Write a protein of this length. Structure first.
Length: 125
């Protein structure tokens, strides 16, 4: 599934349409492809506290690394640095706002994201 359709299907609300349009049509005039690949637990250390967008990403990297989960976000063979910079960008901050925290964390933990011949994130086996 294409990234736009993932975000369209996982909106927390019918009332974020103005952001979805701004992100995809205005702000993103190669595509990202999304597949579910695990059903790991979304940990409450990440969901419960009131982290900013940047902090959450940082806390996500640590949690994946502390558990030795082989998610391309951190064991990737290519340059996380540029990917986590992307994940911290205003564009992925909107993605977070649109789908909510728990779903954003699901996206990073349990889905793969492919751009061209590279997986930006995901645990493959």
């Amino acid at each position: 599934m294409r990234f736009d359709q993932y975000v369209d299907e996982n909106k927390s609300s019918d009332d974020f349409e103005p952001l979805i349009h701004d992100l995809f049509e205005t702000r993103w005039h190669r595509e990202i492809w999304i597949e579910r690949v695990k059903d790991r637990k979304i940990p409450s250390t990440l969901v419960k506290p009131n982290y900013s967008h940047e902090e959450l990403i940082d806390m996500l990297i640590g949690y994946l690394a502390d558990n030795r989960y082989e998610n391309a976000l951190i064991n990737g063979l290519v340059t996380r640095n540029a990917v986590t910079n992307l994940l911290k960008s205003p564009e992925f901050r909107l993605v977070h706002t649109i789908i909510g925290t728990e779903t954003f964390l699901d996206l990073l933990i349990n889905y793969s994201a492919r751009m061209g011949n590279v997986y930006l994130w995901g645990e493959l086996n």
